[PDB]
Design a protein around this ligand. Structure first.
Ligand SMILES: Cc1cn([C@H]2C[C@H](O)[C@@H](COP(=O)(O)OP(=O)(O)OP(=O)(O)O)O2)c(=O)[nH]c1=O
Ligand SMILES: [Ca+2]
Ligand SMILES: [Ca+2]
Ligand SMILES: [Ca+2]
Ligand SMILES: [Ca+2]
Ligand SMILES: [Ca+2]
Ligand SMILES: [Ca+2]
Ligand SMILES: [Ca+2]
Ligand SMILES: [Ca+2]
Ligand SMILES: [Ca+2]
Length: 901
DNA sequence: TCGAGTAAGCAGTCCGCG
DNA sequence: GCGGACTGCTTAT
């Protein structure tokens, strides 16, 4: 096989590399790598190396990496550019793997671990590591085994061995319900002292050294705790055995308020799953506890136990160990679904970076572009310091707040990357500038043509047209990958809807789910078989279809993120190719594109309707336009349609056969106006929305910018079995809104859009009447909590203290002394509840850590003093009032003359 | 919240507005 | 009571 790296590090003048050799075996080597850098040279000197602007360079080969680093410093002292890849390990990878890397994931050791630490006196701080590590579960992907290290004897209690027999039994048998599919994969090792546990763990680690190391909060807790505990018991040298090269660094992570330490393990790639999840899941969760995320992702029940976790080992060591094992498995289950490890490997090997650098799109793109340029013997520029400066972004149209009955939307494929490609925007393609007119003049095609030679953006920038820039070339490659995966995602989505339709008429029989590839649209034969399957088989297929859709979503949405982040990197001062001229060229072109096509669509529809100055485009934000289709429907007349699906078909056909060609003509003209390199503004129909035929539903509404709701029947060619609410920006979509209130507001919206005013009124009246019965957690607001100390003045709120911070201060006063009280953690999220006048907490609200029950001794008081009236007004009535005023509806029935009878 | 970007919404504080 | 100046937070794209 072709060789591929696992990890790479620079340690002084050596590159240390772990890799898979041509026979599929893991190897390690130390290489005295001699890096090269570059300086500009005269024309007279013959060279094969040129910088991205075509200026000749001479290659400097250094005796070692330290000499090269020192040369860079001396060049700074002289005031001359030192060109080339200054991150020498990336140059090493480029030289050693000068081909498209094909990797075999089955040869990569992926380790997933979790530790337990009993701590009677609060949270066990990893920097101190003052308490025994009393359990480690470490899953190894090559062995496919869970290795469980269990401490039986501790200063906090001696316990009996964990029983795999009890672990496997149902909870109704007094067991722990460790899933049957992993029971045979557990290798259980009890220890009568912590020193032998840790020594054995290190020997195990030496034999099965992780390449990818993951888990939940492993970077912020487990890794520093293990390292520091081992360091405390044995000394530094023993702790450094967690690194295969025996090198570690305490790394200080900081943001704007406060800093924290992590431990860099040289020769390991740590991908903490909480951080993978935050970057790649496109959620914003009220809590990031593993129990909360597991429930959300997997629909598994919370791991229940009596008493605090600090007393679980002594009271129920059996459950303690079983829950440690289950926690490790839950991360594996989340990854089986979301596939973020697969994503990280894919993108890491594509860019030729340390796999952990997938968290940094700047590093990822730096490597991709470097490797691309190096293939042509071109030399990358030196990175430079820039002051942070603002620059303009997207245009957002101010909508007229209203109900909107029939709506069709249109959206550009990968807009900003497509602009980069169309205009040919790159560091080395800048051709000059032209005299800019107001944007309005370009939008209305009255400004003089910018250039008859170069490709232009309405910010004044001109670009070469003779050859693609490196940014366009490389963004296109990742875009094409994205397009492939989006195809699989949408097919799986369409397939899911076929199965949902089939579930209306399930067959009474015993059978199996069909063995099919859900990434491809079901054939006629598969569809006929589906119509004869049982509900059980259909539901199994639906689950599999949905999992395939999720896999496609991960692959496509994060490649979209990567290419959009290349645009973003152009506006980040740490990017080697930072240039606000190019960042602004993209955003300003984007503004024009939106408003240009708004004009073109209005013009087209006014023509086919025989009107003048009528506004068909009701809204647009950044890219998409939303078009009112009322007049189109009315042109034929609602009575002509047999059912909802008939007018959806009609609008689908109208959009595709009439509107899209007009939009295409419109953008082709804009391309010629700007003299762009290639027409790539492909705006296709997105949503078709409206009320069910014959209903009193309103279809949709806008309250303002970034705030709307639509009842959608078809989305990008997926025809839903049941209509789907597309709600953007409204409180239903905000993690700060209480769970039960999201649910209620969503149902109010559903009733508004699908059923009408009377239906809304019936539901509102009931919610208002019954909501005090809702569980306190489900009606609590959520907020991130920053700068708690800044507003703490002797335990009381300082000037301008935020409401949620005031709540935390109230909580802190209430738990003074209470030893079984969780502390609110700076920068994490809290639940927040209002409190009625005269409550014993002495303030108008209280807050506590999100994802948790509030501690027992104040819970009864919070429940007794909760201000349901304020809660309802702020979280439910106020937002609903906004929805209904915008939609011109009443959520309460107003008096009429009929009341007199 | 270490990790690409800007636009813009709403909650809440403080305090003016005769 | 509502709105502007401001901080804080969270969303749309
Ligand atoms: C979602 C998102 C968009 N944008 C910008 C760049 C996008 O091209 C532009 C429009 O956003 P979108 O329409 O959400 O996405 P897209 O056009 O890139 O891809 P597609 O519609 O094919 O799924 O807004 C960002 O800069 N960052 C982001 O995270
Ligand atoms: Ca635990
Ligand atoms: Ca120490
Ligand atoms: Ca788009
Ligand atoms: Ca599309
Ligand atoms: Ca059937
Ligand atoms: Ca969009
Ligand atoms: Ca099209
Ligand atoms: Ca889309
Ligand atoms: Ca009490």
């Amino acid at each position: 096989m072709k060789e591929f790296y696992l990890t790479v590090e620079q340690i002084g003048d050596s590159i240390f590399e772990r890799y898979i050799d041509s026979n599929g075996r893991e190897r390690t080597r130390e290489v005295e790598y001699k890096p090269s850098l570059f300086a500009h040279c005269p024309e007279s000197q013959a060279t094969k190396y040129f910088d991205i602007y075509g200026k000749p360079c001479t290659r400097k080969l250094f005796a070692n990496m330290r000499d090269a680093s020192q040369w860079i410093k001396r060049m700074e002292d002289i005031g001359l550019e030192a060109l080339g890849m200054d991150d020498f390990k990336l140059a090493y990878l480029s030289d050693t793997y000068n081909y498209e890397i094909k990797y075999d994931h089955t040869k990569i050791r992926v380790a997933n671990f979790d530790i337990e630490v009993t701590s009677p006196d609060g949270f066990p701080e990893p920097s101190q590591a003052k308490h025994p590590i009393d359990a480690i579960t470490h899953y190894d992907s090559i062995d496919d085994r869970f290795y469980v290290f269990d401490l039986l004897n501790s200063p906090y209690g001696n316990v009996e061995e964990w029983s795999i027999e009890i672990a496997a039994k149902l909870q109704e048998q007094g067991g722990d319900e460790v899933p049957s599919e992993i029971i045979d994969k557990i290798i259980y090792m009890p220890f009568d002292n912590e020193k032998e546990l840790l020594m054995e763990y290190l020997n195990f680690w030496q034999q099965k050294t992780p390449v990818i190391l993951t888990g939940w909060n492993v970077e912020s807790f487990a890794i520093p705790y293990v390292y520091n505990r081992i360091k405390n018991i044995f000394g530094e040298s023993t702790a450094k055995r967690l690194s295969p090269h025996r090198k570690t660094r305490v790394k200080v992570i900081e943001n704007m308020y406060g800093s924290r330490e992590i431990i860099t393990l040289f020769g390991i790639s740590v991908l903490d799953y909480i951080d993978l999840y935050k970057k790649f899941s496109f959620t914003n969760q009220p809590s990031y506890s593993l129990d909360y995320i597991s429930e959300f992702e997997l629909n598994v029940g919370k791991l229940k136990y009596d008493g605090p976790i600090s007393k679980l080992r002594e009271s129920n060591h059996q459950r303690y160990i079983s829950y440690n094992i289950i926690a490790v498995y839950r991360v594996l289950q989340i990854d089986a679904k979301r596939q973020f490890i697969n994503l990280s490997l894919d993108m890491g090997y594509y860019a030729k970076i340390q796999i952990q650098s997938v968290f940094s799109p700047i590093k990822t793109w730096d490597a991709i572009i470097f490797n691309s340029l190096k293939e042509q013997n071109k030399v990358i520029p030196q990175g430079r310091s820039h002051p942070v400066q603002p620059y303009p972004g997207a245009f957002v149209k101010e909508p007229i707040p209203n109900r909107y009955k029939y709506v069709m939307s249109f959206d550009l494929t990968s807009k900003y990357p497509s602009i980069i490609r169309q205009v040919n925007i790159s560091p080395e393609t800048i051709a000059g500038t032209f005299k800019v007119a107001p944007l309005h003049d370009y939008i209305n095609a009255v400004a003089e043509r910018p250039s008859d030679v170069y490709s232009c953006s309405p910010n004044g920038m001109m670009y070469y047209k003779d050859r693609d820039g490196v940014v366009p070339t490389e963004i296109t490659k990742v875009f094409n990958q994205r397009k492939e995966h989006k195809g699989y995602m949408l097919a799986a989505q369409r397939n899911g809807e076929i199965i949902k339709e089939a579930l209306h008429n399930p067959n009474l029989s015993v059978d199996e789910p069909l063995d099919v590839d859900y990434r491809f649209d079901f054939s006629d034969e598969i569809k006929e078989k589906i119509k004869k399957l049982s509900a059980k088989s259909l539901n199994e297929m639906l689950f599999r279809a949905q999992r395939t859709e999720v896999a496609g979503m991960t692959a496509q949405i994060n490649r979209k993120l990567l290419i959009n982040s290349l645009y973003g990197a152009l506006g980040n001062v740490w990017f080697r190719y930072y240039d606000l001229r190019n960042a602004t060229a993209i955003t300003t072109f984007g503004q024009m594109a939106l408003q240009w096509i708004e004009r073109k669509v209005n013009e087209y529809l006014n023509e086919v309707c025989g009107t003048e100055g009528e506004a068909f485009v009701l809204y647009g934000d950044t890219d998409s336009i939303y078009v009112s289709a009322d007049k189109i429907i009315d042109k034929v007349g609602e009575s002509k349609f047999r059912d909802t699906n008939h007018w959806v078909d009609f609008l689908d056909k109208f959009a595709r056969e009439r509107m899209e060609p007009a939009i295409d003509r419109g953008f082709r003209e804009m391309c010629e106006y700007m003299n762009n390199k290639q027409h790539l503004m492909f705006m296709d129909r997105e949503a078709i929305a409206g009320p069910p035929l014959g209903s009193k539903g309103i279809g949709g509404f806008w309250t303002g910018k970034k705030r709307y709701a639509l009842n959608v029947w078809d989305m990008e060619g997926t025809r839903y079995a049941e209509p789907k609410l597309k709600i953007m920006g409204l409180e239903t979509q905000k993690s700060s809104t209480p769970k039960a209130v999201q649910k209620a507001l969503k149902e109010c919206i559903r009733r508004m859009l699908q059923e009408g005013e009377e239906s809304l009124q019936e539901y509102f009246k009931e919610f208002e009447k019954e909501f005090r019965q809702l569980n306190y957690i489900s009606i609590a607001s959520v907020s991130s909590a920053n700068n708690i100390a800044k507003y703490d003045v002797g335990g009381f709120p300082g000037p301008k203290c935020p409401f949620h911070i005031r709540g935390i201060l109230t909580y802190n006063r209430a738990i003074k002394g209470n030893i079984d009280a969780p502390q609110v953690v700076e920068g994490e999220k809290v639940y927040v509840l209002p409190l009625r006048e005269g409550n014993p907490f002495g303030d108008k609200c209280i807050a506590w850590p999100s994802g948790t029950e509030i501690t027992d001794l104040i819970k009864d008081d919070v429940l007794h003093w909760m201000d349901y009236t304020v809660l309802l007004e702020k979280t439910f009535i106020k937002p609903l009032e906004g929805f209904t005023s915008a939609a011109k509806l009443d959520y309460e029935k107003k008096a009429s003359l009929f009341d007199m009878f």
